[PDB]
Amino acid sequence: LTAQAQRLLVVSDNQELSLYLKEELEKQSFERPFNADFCYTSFNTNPQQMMAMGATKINIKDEFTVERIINEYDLVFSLHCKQIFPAKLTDNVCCINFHPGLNPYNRGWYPQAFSIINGLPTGATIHLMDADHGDIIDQQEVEVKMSDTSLTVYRKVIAIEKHLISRNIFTIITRSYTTKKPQAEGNYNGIKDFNALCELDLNSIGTLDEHLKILRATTHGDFKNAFFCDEKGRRFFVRIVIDEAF
Amino acid sequence: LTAQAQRLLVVSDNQELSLYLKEELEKQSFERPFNADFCYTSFNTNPQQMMAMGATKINIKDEFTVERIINEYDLVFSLHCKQIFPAKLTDNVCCINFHPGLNPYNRGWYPQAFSIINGLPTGATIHLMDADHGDIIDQQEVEVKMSDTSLTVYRKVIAIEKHLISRNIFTIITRSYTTKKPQAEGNYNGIKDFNALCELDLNSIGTLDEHLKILRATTHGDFKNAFFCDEKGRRFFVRIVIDEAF
Ligand SMILES: Cc1cn([C@H]2C[C@H](O)[C@@H](COP(=O)(O)OP(=O)(O)O[C@H]3O[C@H](C)[C@@H](N)[C@H](O)[C@H]3O)O2)c(=O)[nH]c1=O
Ligand SMILES: Cc1cn([C@H]2C[C@H](O)[C@@H](COP(=O)(O)OP(=O)(O)O[C@H]3O[C@H](C)[C@@H](N)[C@H](O)[C@H]3O)O2)c(=O)[nH]c1=O
Ligand code: NA
Ligand code: NA
């Protein structure tokens, strides 16, 4: 509960935040010995980017791997880790998640996209992992403008995550934080909910506002997310661009 | 009715088609003397581009200018001329319009944008000007894909206009064409109709298809056409991008 972590495992499928954390850790001076290992899980993200920064592949669904983690580390980060941590892992070693949403709202998948749809707050959250709603170590909201798309909000979120990492890393490693309980249940969205946003139904009836929000939520730079089909079922991918002027 | 035109006035606010025509005319050899003068009318198009290619400014609402044209030229082109030719002009000298639409459909303003909205045929038309529906010298349809925007269709139209200019310029100058009468009344759209498309109403209820068509019709490269407002009435300009993939 109280002693400095000396052996940290970072499980991450995001190179940008992994590099940021690794550089932040190099700036710290801890009284007790400290080592951090980085690992990735996800073939369908950017595994070679993670390799390129020195991470190795780990499989959290390997029950032996989980026993090794419990016996070999005293703290584990889920830094945009795509694999689920099982109860056996979270029950037996302190596991901390770095989530690119503002808990308790739009938990789960692509929080900023759902925030564009439903107008709920977003941002980043550092929270404990417990075998639905881990207690929060720190979080910070970001602003969503009517011009923003999923990418624009996401970059704000990443920036705020980095800030939270710099603000909290010393206290986390020294185990010198108090958490707060979430104050509301909020809500959760899954990958299938995002796919449903992407499958545009040309016949669907709604307000222009509803429709523009779907496009903004599913526009993320040049990703091919949202699409409609013709009668032969050729897919047409759709993106929106919104600009304010003088 | 039958003799070669020897003195052509081209009134144009489109440099691209004016240059194309001027180069096409330089390739012709006519038995009788032939000269063409180019003029532009529109301060709010690209008047300095027209100047740069040697055109001079003309005002068709100058009643004296019109009398001079009638006494000084034997053929007049409206090559995307933004000023209205009055009856006095069209009644007294052969005036020919080069229209970036497929008559009789979506006559008037930005034909391809309205074709994206209403699914009517578009393309280009060369027709006589008579003091609603001049007889047609030649026209050719272009294809509209579900991925196209106003710009994509417009470039096709410009390409086909050029083709029609090359196909028809000798016959026009020699006055050796037969026209056909339009076969249907079709329809007309004005500038105010386009502005109404651009003023997005976020509360408006419709199909996603309707809404995507509005965006495609009002997307034309980086033009700031379509916009919504926030509660303070800051305008947010909107464009769509649609791409087919493998
Ligand atoms: C793969 C993919 C991503 N995106 C956008 C939306 C996302 O918010 C953004 C980043 O995607 P990403 O796969 O790197 O996801 P991450 O930003 O790492 O986060 C995702 O996984 C974490 C493990 C979870 N804790 C997060 O809740 C979940 O949203 O890119 C798309 O718009 N389309 C896509 O196909
Ligand atoms: C000025 C303006 C243009 N556009 C797009 C749509 C247009 O089809 C395209 C070209 O515009 P333009 O002003 O050069 O128009 P032109 O292509 O020269 O044609 C227009 O004037 C001729 C005299 C008329 N005969 C045509 O029916 C009318 O559409 O650019 C926009 O999307 N937004 C704009 O504000
Ligand atoms: Na704290
Ligand atoms: Na003809």
Side-chain angles (χ1 to χ4, degrees), chain A residues 55-84:
Chain A
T56 63
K57 201 178 180 169
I58 197 170
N59 178 10
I60 305 302
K61 297 188 227 198
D62 184 330
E63 291 193 30
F64 176 73
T65 294
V66 165
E67 292 308 310
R68 286 196 50 214
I69 298 174
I70 291 160
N71 296 315
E72 289 163 33
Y73 296 88
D74 51 17
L75 187 59
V76 179
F77 291 176
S78 168
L79 185 62
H80 292 213
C81 177
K82 270 169 191 197
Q83 275 193 312
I84 281 282

Side-chain angles (χ1 to χ4, degrees), chain B residues 29 42 46 52 58 66 79 103-104 113 118 136 138 146 154 174 205 209 236 239 242:
Chain B
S29 20
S42 177
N46 290 311
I58 197 170
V66 165
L79 185 62
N103 285 2
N118 60 32
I136 294 162
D138 199 3
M146 289 176 102
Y154 185 71
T174 61
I205 300 170
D209 193 54
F236 297 77
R239 284 148 252 94
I242 304 178

Side-chain angles (χ1 to χ4, degrees), chain B residues 6-7 17 23 28 47 73 81 90 95 150 162 183 186 195 213 220 229 241:
Chain B
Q6 302 188 10
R7 279 137 29 243
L17 290 171
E23 293 174 20
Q28 310 294 135
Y73 296 88
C81 177
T90 56
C95 294
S150 168
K162 286 174 179 168
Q183 306 227 288
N195 293 327
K213 283 170 173 173
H220 189 111
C229 296
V241 184

